[PDB]
Amino acid sequence: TKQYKNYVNGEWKLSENEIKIYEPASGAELGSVPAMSTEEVDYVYASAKKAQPAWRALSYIERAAYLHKVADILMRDKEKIGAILSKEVAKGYKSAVSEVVRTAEIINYAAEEGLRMEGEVLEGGSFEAASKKKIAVVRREPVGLVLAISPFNYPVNLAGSKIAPALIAGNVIAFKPPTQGSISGLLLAEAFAEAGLPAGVFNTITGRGSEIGDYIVEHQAVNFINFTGSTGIGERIGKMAGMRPIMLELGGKDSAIVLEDADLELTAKNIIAGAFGYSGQRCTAVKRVLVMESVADELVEKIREKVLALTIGNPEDDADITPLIDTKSADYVEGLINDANDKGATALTEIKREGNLICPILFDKVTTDMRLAWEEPFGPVLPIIRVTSVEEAIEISNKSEYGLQASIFTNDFPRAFGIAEQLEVGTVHINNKTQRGTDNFPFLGAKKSGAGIQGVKYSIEAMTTVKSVVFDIK
Amino acid sequence: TKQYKNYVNGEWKLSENEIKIYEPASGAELGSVPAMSTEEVDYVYASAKKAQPAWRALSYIERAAYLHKVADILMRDKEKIGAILSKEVAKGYKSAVSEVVRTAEIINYAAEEGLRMEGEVLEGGSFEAASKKKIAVVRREPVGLVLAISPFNYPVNLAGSKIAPALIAGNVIAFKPPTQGSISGLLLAEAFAEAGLPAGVFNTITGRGSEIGDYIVEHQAVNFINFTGSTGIGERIGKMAGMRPIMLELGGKDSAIVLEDADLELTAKNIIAGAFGYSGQRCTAVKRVLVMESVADELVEKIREKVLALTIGNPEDDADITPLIDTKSADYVEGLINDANDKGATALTEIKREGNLICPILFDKVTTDMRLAWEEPFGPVLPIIRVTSVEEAIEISNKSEYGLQASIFTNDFPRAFGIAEQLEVGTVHINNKTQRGTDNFPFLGAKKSGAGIQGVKYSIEAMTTVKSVVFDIK
Amino acid sequence: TKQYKNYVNGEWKLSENEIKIYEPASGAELGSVPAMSTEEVDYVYASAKKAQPAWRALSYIERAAYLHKVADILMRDKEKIGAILSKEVAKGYKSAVSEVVRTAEIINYAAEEGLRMEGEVLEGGSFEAASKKKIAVVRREPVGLVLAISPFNYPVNLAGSKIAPALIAGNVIAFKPPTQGSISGLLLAEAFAEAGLPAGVFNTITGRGSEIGDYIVEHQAVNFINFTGSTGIGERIGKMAGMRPIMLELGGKDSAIVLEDADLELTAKNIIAGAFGYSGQRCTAVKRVLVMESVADELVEKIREKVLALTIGNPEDDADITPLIDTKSADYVEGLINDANDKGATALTEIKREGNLICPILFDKVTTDMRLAWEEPFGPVLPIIRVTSVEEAIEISNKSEYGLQASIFTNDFPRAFGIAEQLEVGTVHINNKTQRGTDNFPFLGAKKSGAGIQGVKYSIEAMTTVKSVVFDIK
Amino acid sequence: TKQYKNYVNGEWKLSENEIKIYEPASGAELGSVPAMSTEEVDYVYASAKKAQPAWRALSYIERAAYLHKVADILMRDKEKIGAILSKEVAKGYKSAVSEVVRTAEIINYAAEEGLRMEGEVLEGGSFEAASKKKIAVVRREPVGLVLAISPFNYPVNLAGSKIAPALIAGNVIAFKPPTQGSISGLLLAEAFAEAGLPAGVFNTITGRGSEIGDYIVEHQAVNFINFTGSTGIGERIGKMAGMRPIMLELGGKDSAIVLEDADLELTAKNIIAGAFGYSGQRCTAVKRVLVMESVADELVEKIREKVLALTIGNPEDDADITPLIDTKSADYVEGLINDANDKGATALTEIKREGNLICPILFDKVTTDMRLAWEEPFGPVLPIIRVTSVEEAIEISNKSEYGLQASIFTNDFPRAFGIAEQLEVGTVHINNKTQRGTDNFPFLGAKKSGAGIQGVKYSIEAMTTVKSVVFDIK
Ligand SMILES: NC(=O)c1ccc[n+]([C@@H]2O[C@H](COP(=O)([O-])OP(=O)(O)OC[C@H]3O[C@@H](n4cnc5c(N)ncnc54)[C@H](OP(=O)(O)O)[C@@H]3O)[C@@H](O)[C@H]2O)c1
Ligand SMILES: NC(=O)c1ccc[n+]([C@@H]2O[C@H](COP(=O)([O-])OP(=O)(O)OC[C@H]3O[C@@H](n4cnc5c(N)ncnc54)[C@H](OP(=O)(O)O)[C@@H]3O)[C@@H](O)[C@H]2O)c1
Ligand SMILES: NC(=O)c1ccc[n+]([C@@H]2O[C@H](COP(=O)([O-])OP(=O)(O)OC[C@H]3O[C@@H](n4cnc5c(N)ncnc54)[C@H](OP(=O)(O)O)[C@@H]3O)[C@@H](O)[C@H]2O)c1
């Protein structure tokens, strides 16, 4: 079998055991990845803590140059990495190549953002005359060893979104990709290896999170945990973190509030784009439409027609709708579809599943009584919930324990801004679908959608600390 | 008995049960405080979540005006509050009045700092040309309901340091003082009552943390936990917080590194000041001296003479050394004193204890083998540890699991700055004893000394979130 | 005669000559103000440069406390100062009292903003690895002696808007009010006297700007010139300043662009409010309406009716329209009214003048061929210019050499934001009349409307410099 | 003759007249540069104003990409450009190549700094409750057409230091190099031509500043003037600028204050380095030593020995001391040398001049009575002025009308910081010679040394304005 290895302390290492990866669309074996032992995890961490001081001792610009090299390498090999990524997570080929490209972009942005974090000089005289000669020189510092964990839908992108901001500031990294997507995670590891960062600065970990995950997170050598994945695991990590700092990017159930003065055609296209992207396997995605009854029939018919225009098929054919990541996922979605249907929702699209490929389905007349109204499906299923007032829309929206983003389709901005203030979310997009879009922008979620604020600059600030040196001037 | 009441939803409330408070120096009953039931805790929280929206709806300036009123009231009644505080925690009278004064100051500072937190407008064109018409309007928002918990040595000051920054930003408060110091905490509550903040915006909780503490922290109505106290409880809270945000100010074992070119007299006075303040019952306090052998004998003799000049007695007499907060504390300190002595340390001061009053004691020749070298005593005991190199001083320093602050006494600044970079602490004071000093300055601890960065501006930033609204310009 | 005196170096001083002030509405003598000699100007300046070092030596908080005292005094005596201000510049009584109140507010805000200006610590390693041990500690510093000059329509408010930001930062002040409004300027001086600022820190100058103005500005002892007044004098000062820093707030001819989807009633009320405030004697005031022909007739009739509802009379009666500041002004306005009329504009309101009181007049069908379309009148005359496209509105708008503010009345925000980007002005108000409104907001003008950016924070930044101290860490 | 051309609106243009350039060391003709007519100046400006809108319409990243191309090209041709620059201004070859390299660096830094300038969102509720629904979205904007003028000692570097920061923000450029150094200025122009920026965005102007200088500055099409050169011309421009914004980098007479606890050897080397660099033809250069009498003899002898180790000769031989830019300059320096000598100063080095090459000379016993103590020579002549107290050193220092930078050599930092506060300069270097060093650091001068604050970030902020859009949220 094609056995991939972990990058540990400047070397590539296999383990006594391996995990075989298959393509979610065909079942074909892709290769295997190591199933690390806790002793091997200990060595990755011991390696990193050892290398940190010297990494931190480099100049900011030297660290940015290393990262620029990594990004340059990713661009060079984007078709290579993209071909395997496409196969490993059953995501269209072109979009797979786009993930790699977006990764290089965030690595290059974090590299230039990080060498520009400034410190402050504060005056004691601002607080008390007696301390007017006392000044504080405050400068940032790395937290130490950061553990980064990416999800299956963006194993590379959502790894680089953590690695670059961490490294530029002087921290060292321990990266653990998702098992289904670990081969791609190791292909990214190759770029860091070629760029030539000092041994121990960047390392990878592989094994089933359901088996060594608690171990790698509870390990006291870990100073910070940056995670992207399910709410349930985030809750776990939040506790396993203790008083240690963390950044969680969890579930989302983004709602699209459509008022009566919205451009329905523009609204229909955005909802379709955000709802069915990557078969609905996106955290920031319109997962429920709360529309005003008076415009609902018209919006729904447009959405209905558009759903029928989506392509369905294999990743290599760049189909809009591809097979879900695994059988358990497709089964879970089916149960949501069933609960809705059996409960009276109106399926405006055919319910059909072949293997783990579920055709896109539009559900009208969904009520707050159906599971599909609240639970994140992570499949191509979109519920339409008709409301009779903006206040109800807000009520139903905020009712969710999720609060990533939201879209408001209307032409009344001052009103749209008033609504946005009440929406318990991180970002509100006016007349656009939701998105992490433009990584210089803050990215955070409310309630059980996460902890911490991301976006390049915020990530950097979050994974650094401060060192205040106070003295008196004579 | 003089029964104090909790301030809940605009009203003062007693509970079926009470807890009687005594003066640590005389044993005299001071009065009693309610022992709230979990049902009463639920009502405090339900009251606050209900009042939050309307409080958040006020203008920043309106909220600052309320807070300026509270501070003004504290200044007016500073002798009143200070007389009881002095008695409740056996701290000198004048210093007790100073705590109240310092509280008013931080309340007034946080009030003016909070109405000056600005948002940002970001450009999509910074990241990608295609999103050049996309801009992000980012504005801050409260986290919701904040639970504040102060320690016994600063029940008022270290409560106000949490309440003001929280309220100015729109958050609502649930304040729980320490049982020994709860009467004073309710005297501060009186100021918020007189200032007239809306019912539910500010409330207090009382009962033994060892009994209802886990309950008030685990309560899902709580959105943020700001705590000041022991490491053990902080660890607890860190876990009980889940993925919820928290700010912990825990233990410290501040070291004073004395190089060979230090002004020994100036060094001796600072160490004495920071080491014996409030009988060593201060978190930011020189708790261990790591001095260069060649200057050790001279520094120790000065410190020895100065220790003998300290006054010992009752809080009402403004004595330097007053009785420790309680019997268990005095006993714990005595064991530290004993371990050191039996192990060979050189007591340069008489070991004497009367009741819970422990005379100040200087220990020379302390080794890393004695408990006193590592454990936070919270008593008037100072260990002197002689080193033979700056590298050893740093080694022994960083060896502690504590990392609040540190002092470096030397006349070589560039070198002092190089050392400060290696010291695993929050703040490094050059030629001054450690201190939270000047609240506009950041205040944080490394390792097990805490989580989060305080100081007025940082507190505010920490207890707020962000709301990003993205739209496109045509 | 009631002879007012200048506050010079802690003392009040008369001059050999005086200038008698009369009430613009009745002609009644108000008192007299000194007509300083250049030698007296030299002493004010010598006094200030002498006092600066010690003022700069105070703590920020000490300087903010002085300013808070001044504001508190202004609030106490607001009816007193307002009664004379109302009489000196023929402005309604209540609005006069409001000027004083607004002054206290900006003095208090600048006081709290100034003790919060922070410095920076920069890394050489951001630019070059070789300089990675080199850090820069950058801290702000006063420019020195600032000369402040207020206009007749806001002699107190627009003096305090310069004095407070200057003083908080450590600068010393030389204040020169307008001759017509100098008595009120000296009443403000009284507040600084009572607050007890050190001798020389704050002083006043009086005499006709047309006679000693060039002298006080060209004086080399002056380090910065902050001026509010006419464009012609601003141009002058710009040149007399040399390479010295200045801040000019000059003329304005604010346009109100009314698109076809505007709420005409809300638009009509805002235009009326901003156009006729203080008889049109305001810099930030809608001075020309560029409306879409299709909605023009309707908007004009509303505006016509509202103009007729305005009150006309004496300041003491709080009339909307009061007598203009002087005869030359009323004559100038009349000529504008005449040029328009003789040229064919449609006067929808009666042309009437009594003394120097000019009734409000609305002119429809104004063309770019009439003086009234371009020249700032500073009288109750409003021209309506009908356009046929948004592009023409922008063309005609930007055609003016003035660029203070602008209002856009429309319900299309993305479009409104696109237009705002093309308008050559400082601030663009959407669905509101123009205004300096909320002093924490930036206030600046484009083209010949000024130099520099104001608003509290910006004023402070503008009247301070930086001191960079660079050293290497070993 | 080799006739260079100006880059105007995407094309290279000669003029009817030309100016022949010769090498200051050999007299050899280097080529010729156009002597533009005012009509040609008008076309350069008309071209730029025409191209600005579309340049401003590009995305920030697109503009940074153009600039990165220019820098990359400069690096590629650094030996080429450096060979001619070395010959045109008689500066060593390797240092000439270093100027080009440093230019690319500042162009690349400004490019990444500029796409990271953020805007702000301000709340009306911070100032008044009534405006709590009113928010201000403040975004930066270019000033328009910027006129950049570099000096002869850094025609390329100090051109790029103005061009890049200007362009990245959306401004267009009109660049005018010094006549002696115009050929090199046009070689830089070639890089902007090859990078392919749109026609009109970047253009050059050539002709004698003494003949067309006033014209190009007074031209109303110019929105901002960024100049580096003599104080006399800066004064001129300051006036010709009117109320228009400008940035002036003028003369300097940097002093090196040497206290009694300084490391004399380290001090001697720095003074030599900063004083004799480029034959003393540097603005930021130790131009006068104010040393404590007790350490003066020792410091002077060290400096004396080192001066004798400096190399003297031709630029191509990379000599330390090369021929001065021109005859008038050498004559001027000679007069300073003469005034000092005839007045009693002690020349510790031989006074010798061949052609325009003046050997380095050290003058001890200089007094405040000699011209050399105050006037900027721009030649290899260093005066030593012995003082008897730190207070006198400060007095004599601040006595100069110059205030660029200063060095303080001492081991007492708190004291050094106190002195730095009193020194009327832009930057104070502790134990290092003065320097513009590390372009991310602020660079400004006090008194007659300039106007405005430079350093990448500050340059960008200085050549941009703000556009505030205010609306209310419903
Ligand atoms: N908000 C955002 O920014 C964001 C972005 C994209 C996706 N997501 C969310 O992610 C979910 C889909 O991703 P997923 O199914 O890959 O998530 P998941 O099941 O929570 O797992 C994601 C990652 O966590 C690991 N993991 C599992 N148990 C762990 C343990 N206790 N300790 C440490 N790590 C552990 C996995 O390793 P294994 O693969 O071996 O189990 C993997 O690296 C959705 O909820 C979606 O909304 C969030
Ligand atoms: N780092 C800093 O900024 C800072 C400042 C000052 C002091 N300190 C630290 O605080 C300690 C001394 O103060 P302390 O003895 O008051 O600390 P503590 O015994 O840890 O208790 C602190 C506070 O926690 C409450 N509490 C106890 N257990 C609880 C639990 N189960 N869950 C939630 N709340 C509970 C207490 O109420 P009850 O009294 O009813 O238990 C009290 O208000 C030292 O370790 C010291 O250095 C830290
Ligand atoms: N942009 C803004 O924020 C702002 C605000 C309000 C008004 N304005 C503008 O100001 C004008 C109306 O105000 P105004 O009549 O007070 O203006 P002005 O006649 O130009 O005078 C302004 C001030 O300058 C003084 N002065 C006259 N000549 C001077 C000189 N050569 N040197 C130094 N000072 C001199 C005056 O004292 P004397 O009384 O002795 O002449 C007065 O204090 C209008 O054009 C208006 O739009 C601008």
XYZ file of N, CA, C and O in Angstrom, chain B residues 45-99:
220
model
N -29.925 35.096 38.228
C -29.561 34.937 36.828
C -30.720 35.228 35.879
O -30.517 35.817 34.803
N -31.927 34.804 36.253
C -33.092 35.060 35.411
C -33.362 36.571 35.355
O -33.767 37.115 34.323
N -33.121 37.244 36.477
C -33.320 38.681 36.584
C -32.385 39.427 35.647
O -32.818 40.316 34.910
N -31.105 39.049 35.682
C -30.061 39.659 34.853
C -30.257 39.472 33.337
O -30.106 40.425 32.575
N -30.580 38.255 32.897
C -30.796 37.985 31.463
C -32.002 38.771 30.950
O -32.083 39.150 29.772
N -32.939 39.017 31.855
C -34.136 39.755 31.523
C -33.828 41.237 31.364
O -34.376 41.900 30.481
N -32.939 41.753 32.207
C -32.572 43.165 32.162
C -31.506 43.534 31.134
O -31.421 44.692 30.727
N -30.710 42.564 30.699
C -29.631 42.835 29.747
C -29.979 43.609 28.465
O -29.335 44.608 28.143
N -30.983 43.152 27.706
C -31.359 43.854 26.474
C -31.571 45.370 26.620
O -31.070 46.155 25.813
N -32.314 45.780 27.643
C -32.585 47.200 27.880
C -31.350 47.959 28.365
O -31.228 49.158 28.137
N -30.449 47.261 29.047
C -29.221 47.867 29.538
C -28.339 48.062 28.307
O -27.746 49.113 28.117
N -28.270 47.040 27.465
C -27.477 47.112 26.251
C -28.023 48.179 25.313
O -27.294 48.750 24.516
N -29.318 48.447 25.418
C -29.981 49.443 24.576
C -29.649 50.881 24.951
O -29.878 51.794 24.159
N -29.127 51.085 26.159
C -28.762 52.419 26.601
C -27.554 52.885 25.798
O -26.931 52.098 25.094
N -27.238 54.172 25.880
C -26.070 54.691 25.176
C -24.861 54.437 26.076
O -24.997 54.285 27.294
N -23.680 54.374 25.483
C -22.475 54.139 26.264
C -22.330 55.201 27.347
O -22.018 54.894 28.507
N -22.561 56.455 26.969
C -22.421 57.531 27.926
C -23.396 57.397 29.107
O -23.060 57.736 30.247
N -24.595 56.888 28.852
C -25.554 56.724 29.935
C -25.018 55.711 30.936
O -25.183 55.875 32.142
N -24.381 54.659 30.434
C -23.825 53.625 31.301
C -22.599 54.124 32.060
O -22.355 53.710 33.186
N -21.831 55.024 31.453
C -20.660 55.566 32.112
C -21.093 56.508 33.227
O -20.415 56.624 34.259
N -22.222 57.180 33.023
C -22.730 58.127 34.008
C -23.175 57.406 35.273
O -23.012 57.917 36.388
N -23.755 56.224 35.090
C -24.201 55.395 36.205
C -22.969 55.001 37.014
O -22.939 55.147 38.228
N -21.951 54.510 36.316
C -20.714 54.077 36.942
C -19.959 55.210 37.647
O -19.322 54.981 38.678
N -20.014 56.418 37.086
C -19.357 57.575 37.698
C -20.082 57.899 38.999
O -19.482 58.349 39.969
N -21.385 57.650 39.021
C -22.184 57.879 40.222
C -21.711 56.911 41.336
O -21.450 57.324 42.477
N -21.587 55.631 40.987
C -21.146 54.599 41.923
C -19.795 54.949 42.541
O -19.607 54.852 43.751
N -18.851 55.353 41.698
C -17.526 55.737 42.164
C -17.610 56.946 43.109
O -16.948 56.985 44.146
N -18.433 57.925 42.743
C -18.608 59.126 43.556
C -19.151 58.747 44.930
O -18.737 59.292 45.945
N -20.088 57.805 44.955
C -20.671 57.335 46.208
C -19.629 56.608 47.071
O -19.593 56.777 48.285
N -18.775 55.811 46.442
C -17.715 55.087 47.143
C -16.722 56.047 47.820
O -16.224 55.788 48.923
N -16.422 57.149 47.143
C -15.509 58.134 47.679
C -16.122 58.814 48.903
O -15.435 59.085 49.897
N -17.418 59.088 48.815
C -18.167 59.731 49.882
C -18.204 58.867 51.131
O -17.999 59.359 52.238
N -18.461 57.579 50.944
C -18.542 56.634 52.051
C -17.282 55.794 52.239
O -17.368 54.701 52.789
N -16.124 56.290 51.801
C -14.890 55.507 51.911
C -14.409 55.165 53.320
O -13.762 54.119 53.526
N -14.727 56.026 54.285
C -14.350 55.786 55.682
C -15.291 54.753 56.296
O -14.880 53.917 57.089
N -16.559 54.828 55.907
C -17.588 53.916 56.377
C -17.276 52.506 55.912
O -17.146 51.597 56.730
N -17.151 52.331 54.597
C -16.843 51.029 54.002
C -15.483 50.517 54.478
O -15.331 49.335 54.794
N -14.507 51.416 54.554
C -13.178 51.048 55.017
C -13.088 50.582 56.473
O -12.219 49.780 56.820
N -13.960 51.081 57.340
C -13.942 50.665 58.740
C -14.387 49.195 58.882
O -13.842 48.439 59.687
N -15.372 48.793 58.087
C -15.861 47.429 58.137
C -14.947 46.476 57.385
O -14.712 45.355 57.832
N -14.438 46.917 56.242
C -13.537 46.089 55.453
C -12.303 45.744 56.295
O -11.876 44.591 56.341
N -11.749 46.759 56.959
C -10.590 46.601 57.829
C -10.845 45.502 58.861
O -9.983 44.662 59.102
N -12.041 45.519 59.454
C -12.453 44.547 60.462
C -12.752 43.168 59.902
O -12.448 42.168 60.548
N -13.372 43.102 58.729
C -13.718 41.816 58.151
C -12.535 40.982 57.652
O -12.554 39.756 57.766
N -11.504 41.613 57.101
C -10.362 40.836 56.623
C -9.039 41.125 57.351
O -7.967 40.812 56.845
N -9.131 41.709 58.545
C -7.967 42.039 59.374
C -6.847 42.741 58.620
O -5.665 42.382 58.723
N -7.225 43.746 57.849
C -6.252 44.511 57.099
C -6.258 45.904 57.707
O -7.303 46.404 58.119
N -5.088 46.522 57.785
C -5.003 47.852 58.361
C -6.128 48.771 57.909
O -6.614 48.670 56.779
N -6.534 49.684 58.787
C -7.611 50.600 58.465
C -7.351 51.527 57.282
O -8.174 51.618 56.375
N -6.222 52.221 57.290
C -5.899 53.153 56.204
C -5.793 52.493 54.837
O -6.194 53.062 53.829
N -5.246 51.292 54.807
C -5.108 50.540 53.572
C -6.468 50.034 53.118
O -6.686 49.807 51.932
N -7.376 49.844 54.070
C -8.721 49.381 53.767
C -9.458 50.527 53.069
O -10.185 50.320 52.111
N -9.256 51.742 53.564
C -9.873 52.930 52.987
C -9.271 53.140 51.597
O -9.931 53.631 50.677
N -8.008 52.755 51.449
C -7.309 52.875 50.169
C -7.847 51.904 49.140
O -7.805 52.182 47.941
N -8.338 50.756 49.593
C -8.875 49.789 48.653
C -10.123 50.406 48.026
O -10.301 50.353 46.814
